[PDB]
Amino acid sequence: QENPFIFKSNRFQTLYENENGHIRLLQKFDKRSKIFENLQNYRLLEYKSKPHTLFLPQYTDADFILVVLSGKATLTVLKSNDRNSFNLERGDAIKLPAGTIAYLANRDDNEDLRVLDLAIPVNKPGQLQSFLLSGTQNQPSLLSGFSKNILEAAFNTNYEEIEKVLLEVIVKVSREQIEELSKNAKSSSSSESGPFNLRSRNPIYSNKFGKFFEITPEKNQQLQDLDIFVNSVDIKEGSLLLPNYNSRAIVIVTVTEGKGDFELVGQSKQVQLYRAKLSPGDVFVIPAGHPVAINASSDLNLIGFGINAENNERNFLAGEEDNVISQVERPVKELAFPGSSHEVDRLLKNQKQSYFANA
Amino acid sequence: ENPFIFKSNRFQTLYENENGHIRLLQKFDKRSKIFENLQNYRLLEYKSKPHTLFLPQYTDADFILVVLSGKATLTVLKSNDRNSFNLERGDAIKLPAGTIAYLANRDDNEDLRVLDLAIPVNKPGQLQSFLLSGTQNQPSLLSGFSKNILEAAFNTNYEEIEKVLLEQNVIVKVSREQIEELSKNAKSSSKKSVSSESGPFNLRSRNPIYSNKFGKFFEITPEKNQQLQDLDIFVNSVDIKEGSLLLPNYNSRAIVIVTVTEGKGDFELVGQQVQLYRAKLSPGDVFVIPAGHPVAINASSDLNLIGFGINAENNERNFLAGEEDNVISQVERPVKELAFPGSSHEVDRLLKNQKQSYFANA
Amino acid sequence: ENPFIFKSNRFQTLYENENGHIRLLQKFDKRSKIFENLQNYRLLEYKSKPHTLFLPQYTDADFILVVLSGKATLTVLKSNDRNSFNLERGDAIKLPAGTIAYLANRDDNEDLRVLDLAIPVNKPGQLQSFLLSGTQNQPSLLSGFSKNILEAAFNTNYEEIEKVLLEVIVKVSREQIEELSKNAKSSSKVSSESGPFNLRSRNPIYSNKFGKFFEITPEKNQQLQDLDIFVNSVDIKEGSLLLPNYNSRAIVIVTVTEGKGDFELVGQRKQVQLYRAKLSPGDVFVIPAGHPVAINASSDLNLIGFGINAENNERNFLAGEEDNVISQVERPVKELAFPGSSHEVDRLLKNQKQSYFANA
């Protein structure tokens, strides 16, 4: 309430859970505050599964982006006349078009699987609508939805046999089954259909204090259609991502591992700062323009989805490179700041670092 | 408490006279907050009797006309030009907001019927017409302007502007002499205007996507016509023969406003926490298939449907029955065994039972 | 009674000193539900006295500047670059939201008038400004950070940061102004991807003895394309008149720059309604798509239109020789549509011999 921007790991409602994993949905952005009126049509989700488990055939009414935080996975993606399976490592992300049926296996025999989904509902702003093939209990099948009558006309079978075979959740699969599910899969390496790794192209910001990898529409067609960019950022224990703002981009920053705090600058003439402590599970939101600083307690990693990516431009307010402040003319530097121009131009050359520094 | 069926009843008569009708379907978001994303789509029927003309008029809304039946001459004006078009069943053309046009039923015996997808430009889901044609209990758009502008404007005294243009019917009886003159020169549609950027296109002047002994599914994506590319709409025409079935299928991302042209039948829609929404279908009736919702449609008599599909680009339709595009029968052997009670072998055999595709016997 | 005219005084003042000001016309949509689709567009006027300088700032809205009068030096910053532009009457430049820039009146006598169409990126109709300008009346955006981030970020003791950076329009010297003039490119001819374009560079779409109508569009210029906007500068001669015309699909935000005159708009509410208002420098009005509009001029009258939903717009006239859409109606239909005769209608339409603008 003292801060609207920081959605705590608790504020994730839990959709479904079993002895094999859970799908948890974040709090609807525009509810927390009227101020996030534009993110009303974007949802976050966390898929987590123990080893040798299977999220069964399912589709929804939302364009998905899955960003494999940790673990090894086999995502099998059904078209109507084709099917294509993919092995997924950390930093692999792929777009799941609304309507697409697909299932997710954790292939690692020890490691937990952890997947961060950005969802865009296409039917009503911010409402997700899932149709399970696995007509389990309490919830019957999407096929249960039809009538004995129609199900017969269609499948060309007595209802007794359909009811038996088809109608009568994340389940447990045998070690041998995951071999089969896998053996055939394609791997990442900016493709179309296949998955692509956030990190498998040089980072845009790299130094002794952190890494900044980021895939934009100008660099991946999957992302173009939705106008999003997906980024991963490492800030090494006891350091700093330097003050910066995104020209036009709104970020959903999520925390995969580490601890730390962020400082956001916001609000007429009443610039107010927004602090919060960061832990795994936690989200915050960087509305375009609002500048932000990120400090790491332990080894902190972040996963951000920028909305309105196309032509976004991230300007820093400190360090050597991309310090827009230092682009100001000397005479104008004089007026803007109490200090003299040779007194500004020297304090800006005090940080020899760029993008990241020390606490 | 089925929000998806808009029975004919839900049409409001914008205008009626001895010569024709113009109906406007209920705002979709007025039915239910399910349809907040059909907010800015309106449907209208246009029916007019032989040898009648909807006089010049434009509207602050992009229109996609589909002639359902009868024979029309559609004249379209531009700031500086004019082009005539004779239209039959299945002929579809986009008329952009501001486009002055007029539409006469050139057939002698038969009525003319037309389904219109209106996309208002100025204020969500609210169209406004402008008439050149004027009366007295409805002065024309030019009546709008003051004397002082009308005289400056037209460089005529009010006495004659009033007499010649304004005063002393938005659908009027017209002669044979007149309707032949309107139609002379005017162009038809073809195959090499099934992707035309200008003229009308026929839904059926290229082969259907799905077709067997029980039904026919014609569909024009934006891919196959630039006119539908601006508004990201698709228009399909679907015939389901008496005692047959449009097999269970969903759209991946496209919302569809379905209208009934001729025939009777009924639909079953799976929604939400899982729910069957059904109802009988008669001509005039409209229902909505939300993206991802598996729909089935069943015909009692020879049935014809006109869908417009909002969010058309990248829309895959994935069927749940029969050989072809049956997504269920693409699940890796063992997952079928885990997903469905059945053995993988039992799943595979049942899916093979229906050897038909897209449409089937009921 | 007429919700279309926004009198000059519906402009709220965001800031004002003895050097310039910044006004922000009230929300179109707060005026009326009628203008819902304009909810996300804001109008601003920047005025500034000679030898002044709106300090470095950025805003969460795409800015389309039209310079109404004055001379100026709009200086634009990227993360790692600076280009500056000498601007004059007609010069329009787009600033992406998140661009830091600073504008200066480089004239010694005439004030600087800019008309901004602002498009918030964050929350519909909501300008968040971010003053890099460090005072107490408006504490620098840098203020917001805690001593600790600040000391680490610049790697400097806090007492050299309070001192130097923290502790909006301002006066400036001739040698200072001459500085910003020294190496600063101009407009000319447009389609130049990132410079300024003059609204009167290309020839006017309509021009005669009674007015000029200049209009750049997404077609003619990539910068407009993105925001799908057109930008026109209509001139109308004293005792002359822009003949009744409607835009097919374009919602125009018309802003009277100088002169006086009146607009007739034809909306509804048996249906057709004449919406009227006298016009004067600062007055704004809205012309919804499809709504016919004539503009009279009491005195020589310039207008700056921001076309919204610009691509594929066709403006149709309803009087005069050219682009007159009524004269395209077939002869037997004129007979029918109008109470008079094919022939009588043909004559009345041939009576106005001028096109676009005419005498009153």
PDB file of C-alpha atoms in Angstrom, chain C residues 248-345:
ATOM      1  CA  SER C 248     -14.030   9.720 -44.050  1.00  0.00           C
ATOM      2  CA  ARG C 249     -12.444   8.308 -40.829  1.00  0.00           C
ATOM      3  CA  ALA C 250     -10.134  11.057 -39.358  1.00  0.00           C
ATOM      4  CA  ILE C 251     -10.827  12.749 -35.945  1.00  0.00           C
ATOM      5  CA  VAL C 252      -9.135  16.220 -36.286  1.00  0.00           C
ATOM      6  CA  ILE C 253      -8.041  18.398 -33.286  1.00  0.00           C
ATOM      7  CA  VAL C 254      -8.196  21.906 -34.939  1.00  0.00           C
ATOM      8  CA  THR C 255      -6.331  24.735 -33.061  1.00  0.00           C
ATOM      9  CA  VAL C 256      -6.810  28.459 -34.130  1.00  0.00           C
ATOM     10  CA  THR C 257      -3.258  29.941 -34.308  1.00  0.00           C
ATOM     11  CA  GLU C 258      -4.298  33.465 -35.361  1.00  0.00           C
ATOM     12  CA  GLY C 259      -7.277  35.320 -36.913  1.00  0.00           C
ATOM     13  CA  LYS C 260     -10.986  35.043 -36.076  1.00  0.00           C
ATOM     14  CA  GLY C 261     -13.900  33.198 -37.695  1.00  0.00           C
ATOM     15  CA  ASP C 262     -16.597  30.579 -36.958  1.00  0.00           C
ATOM     16  CA  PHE C 263     -17.110  26.828 -37.609  1.00  0.00           C
ATOM     17  CA  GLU C 264     -20.402  25.081 -38.454  1.00  0.00           C
ATOM     18  CA  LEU C 265     -20.310  21.318 -37.607  1.00  0.00           C
ATOM     19  CA  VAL C 266     -23.303  18.988 -38.520  1.00  0.00           C
ATOM     20  CA  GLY C 267     -23.740  16.255 -35.885  1.00  0.00           C
ATOM     21  CA  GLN C 268     -27.035  14.861 -34.466  1.00  0.00           C
ATOM     22  CA  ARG C 269     -29.501  15.254 -31.497  1.00  0.00           C
ATOM     23  CA  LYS C 270     -35.326  15.000 -35.954  1.00  0.00           C
ATOM     24  CA  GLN C 271     -31.577  14.057 -35.978  1.00  0.00           C
ATOM     25  CA  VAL C 272     -29.230  16.575 -37.758  1.00  0.00           C
ATOM     26  CA  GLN C 273     -27.938  19.351 -35.406  1.00  0.00           C
ATOM     27  CA  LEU C 274     -25.876  22.477 -36.354  1.00  0.00           C
ATOM     28  CA  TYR C 275     -22.984  22.837 -33.789  1.00  0.00           C
ATOM     29  CA  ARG C 276     -21.690  26.473 -33.962  1.00  0.00           C
ATOM     30  CA  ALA C 277     -18.951  28.578 -32.249  1.00  0.00           C
ATOM     31  CA  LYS C 278     -16.968  31.794 -33.001  1.00  0.00           C
ATOM     32  CA  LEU C 279     -13.149  31.086 -33.179  1.00  0.00           C
ATOM     33  CA  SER C 280     -10.124  33.072 -31.826  1.00  0.00           C
ATOM     34  CA  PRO C 281      -6.368  32.409 -31.237  1.00  0.00           C
ATOM     35  CA  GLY C 282      -6.113  29.493 -28.741  1.00  0.00           C
ATOM     36  CA  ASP C 283      -9.697  28.108 -29.178  1.00  0.00           C
ATOM     37  CA  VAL C 284      -9.590  24.339 -30.115  1.00  0.00           C
ATOM     38  CA  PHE C 285     -12.361  22.249 -31.742  1.00  0.00           C
ATOM     39  CA  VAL C 286     -12.888  18.534 -32.643  1.00  0.00           C
ATOM     40  CA  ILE C 287     -14.290  17.324 -36.057  1.00  0.00           C
ATOM     41  CA  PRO C 288     -15.351  13.671 -35.565  1.00  0.00           C
ATOM     42  CA  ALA C 289     -14.926  11.445 -38.672  1.00  0.00           C
ATOM     43  CA  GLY C 290     -17.918  11.840 -41.036  1.00  0.00           C
ATOM     44  CA  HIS C 291     -19.055  15.175 -39.447  1.00  0.00           C
ATOM     45  CA  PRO C 292     -19.430  17.931 -42.121  1.00  0.00           C
ATOM     46  CA  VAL C 293     -17.654  21.234 -41.254  1.00  0.00           C
ATOM     47  CA  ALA C 294     -17.419  24.720 -42.882  1.00  0.00           C
ATOM     48  CA  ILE C 295     -14.967  27.308 -41.414  1.00  0.00           C
ATOM     49  CA  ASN C 296     -15.688  31.060 -41.981  1.00  0.00           C
ATOM     50  CA  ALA C 297     -12.920  33.706 -41.440  1.00  0.00           C
ATOM     51  CA  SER C 298     -13.831  37.186 -40.056  1.00  0.00           C
ATOM     52  CA  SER C 299     -10.067  38.009 -40.473  1.00  0.00           C
ATOM     53  CA  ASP C 300      -7.182  36.020 -42.134  1.00  0.00           C
ATOM     54  CA  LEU C 301      -7.241  32.711 -40.091  1.00  0.00           C
ATOM     55  CA  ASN C 302      -4.541  29.946 -39.749  1.00  0.00           C
ATOM     56  CA  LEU C 303      -5.510  26.514 -38.208  1.00  0.00           C
ATOM     57  CA  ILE C 304      -3.312  23.478 -37.211  1.00  0.00           C
ATOM     58  CA  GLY C 305      -5.091  20.109 -37.498  1.00  0.00           C
ATOM     59  CA  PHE C 306      -3.904  16.911 -35.814  1.00  0.00           C
ATOM     60  CA  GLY C 307      -5.588  14.129 -37.822  1.00  0.00           C
ATOM     61  CA  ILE C 308      -6.074  11.031 -35.604  1.00  0.00           C
ATOM     62  CA  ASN C 309      -6.547   7.643 -37.402  1.00  0.00           C
ATOM     63  CA  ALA C 310      -4.915   9.270 -40.494  1.00  0.00           C
ATOM     64  CA  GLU C 311      -4.004   6.307 -42.899  1.00  0.00           C
ATOM     65  CA  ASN C 312      -6.516   5.838 -45.831  1.00  0.00           C
ATOM     66  CA  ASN C 313      -8.521   8.970 -44.798  1.00  0.00           C
ATOM     67  CA  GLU C 314     -10.446  10.589 -47.706  1.00  0.00           C
ATOM     68  CA  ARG C 315     -11.817  14.137 -47.007  1.00  0.00           C
ATOM     69  CA  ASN C 316     -14.870  14.704 -49.296  1.00  0.00           C
ATOM     70  CA  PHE C 317     -16.233  18.201 -50.180  1.00  0.00           C
ATOM     71  CA  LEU C 318     -19.975  18.861 -50.559  1.00  0.00           C
ATOM     72  CA  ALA C 319     -19.788  22.050 -52.736  1.00  0.00           C
ATOM     73  CA  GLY C 320     -17.626  23.457 -55.570  1.00  0.00           C
ATOM     74  CA  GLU C 321     -16.110  21.834 -58.727  1.00  0.00           C
ATOM     75  CA  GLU C 322     -13.414  19.459 -57.370  1.00  0.00           C
ATOM     76  CA  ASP C 323     -13.613  16.562 -54.791  1.00  0.00           C
ATOM     77  CA  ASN C 324     -17.360  17.435 -54.538  1.00  0.00           C
ATOM     78  CA  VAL C 325     -18.746  13.925 -53.713  1.00  0.00           C
ATOM     79  CA  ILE C 326     -22.443  14.875 -54.290  1.00  0.00           C
ATOM     80  CA  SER C 327     -21.779  15.493 -58.030  1.00  0.00           C
ATOM     81  CA  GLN C 328     -20.629  11.807 -58.311  1.00  0.00           C
ATOM     82  CA  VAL C 329     -24.297  10.726 -57.599  1.00  0.00           C
ATOM     83  CA  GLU C 330     -25.740   9.347 -60.933  1.00  0.00           C
ATOM     84  CA  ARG C 331     -28.322  11.703 -62.668  1.00  0.00           C
ATOM     85  CA  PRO C 332     -31.417   9.469 -62.068  1.00  0.00           C
ATOM     86  CA  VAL C 333     -30.395   9.192 -58.339  1.00  0.00           C
ATOM     87  CA  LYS C 334     -30.032  13.016 -57.921  1.00  0.00           C
ATOM     88  CA  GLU C 335     -33.639  13.220 -59.340  1.00  0.00           C
ATOM     89  CA  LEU C 336     -34.647  10.664 -56.591  1.00  0.00           C
ATOM     90  CA  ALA C 337     -32.439  11.652 -53.563  1.00  0.00           C
ATOM     91  CA  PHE C 338     -33.184  15.439 -53.919  1.00  0.00           C
ATOM     92  CA  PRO C 339     -36.629  17.106 -54.056  1.00  0.00           C
ATOM     93  CA  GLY C 340     -35.636  18.924 -57.289  1.00  0.00           C
ATOM     94  CA  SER C 341     -34.606  17.536 -60.714  1.00  0.00           C
ATOM     95  CA  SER C 342     -31.387  15.881 -62.082  1.00  0.00           C
ATOM     96  CA  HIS C 343     -31.014  19.073 -64.227  1.00  0.00           C
ATOM     97  CA  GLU C 344     -31.861  21.646 -61.404  1.00  0.00           C
ATOM     98  CA  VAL C 345     -29.311  19.917 -59.059  1.00  0.00           C
TER      99      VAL C 345
END
